Amino acid sequence: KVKQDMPPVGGYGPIDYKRNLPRRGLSGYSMFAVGIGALLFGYWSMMRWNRERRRLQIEDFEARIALMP
Amino acid sequence: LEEMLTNNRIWRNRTVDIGVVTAEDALNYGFSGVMLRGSGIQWDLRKTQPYDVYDQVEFDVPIGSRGDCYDRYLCRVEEMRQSIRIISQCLNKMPPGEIKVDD
């Protein structure tokens, strides 16, 4: 008969050993640019809302002071 | 795993300069292994004194210049990868001769 030992048609195809750890492109300083940007949004909006809340504050004190007598 | 570690500020910043070794010192203390690998003093038994057909297959050993115990880690890693190379080429080269000697 023939022999049943293993090796097949040669090569088993290619195999990739070498190291790969790629792909993060979002990082220049521009990460700072987007974060600091987010701050620049927060202070804008929050500024507005605190102004509004002061307006309400004066209005409430007006309620009280009109009550006082 | 290499993304799991290796640029982790924690693991690195825990092991960086801890337990370094001078090459000649390692020789006197007789360290043989990833020690000599990762700290200078390029040496291997696999390359220098081949004990079997393990001579033939191609691959390359890592080293490190900081002797820093971090180098030794990365050297173990790269030896795993090179081990993959050797396994591959071995799967390609396997002769169908026989198992035991004939005596």
Chain B interface test: which of A17, A19, A20, A24 (most B C-beta within 10 Å): A17
Q: How was this structure determined?
A: cryo-EM
Q: Which of A5, A7, A21 sits opposite B3 (nearest CB)?
A: A21
Other beta carbons within 10 Å of B78: 19
Alpha helices by DSSP H, listed for B53-93, are 70-93
Chain A interface test: which of B3, B88, B90, B100 (most A C-beta within 10 Å): B88
* Helix/strand/coil for A17: coil
- Cβ(B80)–Cβ(B74) below 8 Å: no
CB contact (8 A) between residue B3 and residue A10: no
User: What is d(CA A18, CA A30) in angstroms, rounded to the nearest whole number?
Assistant: 31
Residue B41 burial class via C-beta count within 10 angstroms: exposed 0-12, middle 13-18, buried 19 and up: middle
Token look-up 């080269």 returns B93
Q: Which of B88, B94, B96 sits opposite A15 (nearest CB)?
A: B88
Longest dimension (CA), chain A: 119
* Helix/strand/coil for A63: helix
Residues of B with CB under 8 A from a CB of A: 2-3, 78, 81-82, 84-85, 88, 91-92, 94-96
Resolution (A): 3.9
Other beta carbons within 10 Å of A17: 15
Phi-psi region of B2 (alpha: psi -120 to 50; beta: other; left: phi over 0): alpha
Other beta carbons within 10 Å of B26: 18
Alpha helices by DSSP H, listed for chain A, are 30-67
Angle formed at CA B61 by CA B55 and CA B65, multiple of 5 degrees: 150
User: What is d(CA A10, CA A7) in angstroms, rounded to the nearest whole number?
Assistant: 8
Phi-psi region of A37 (alpha: psi -120 to 50; beta: other; left: phi over 0): alpha
For residue B15, what are the contacts with CB-CB under 8 A and spacing of at least 6? B69, B70, B73
Q: How many residues does chain B have?
A: 103
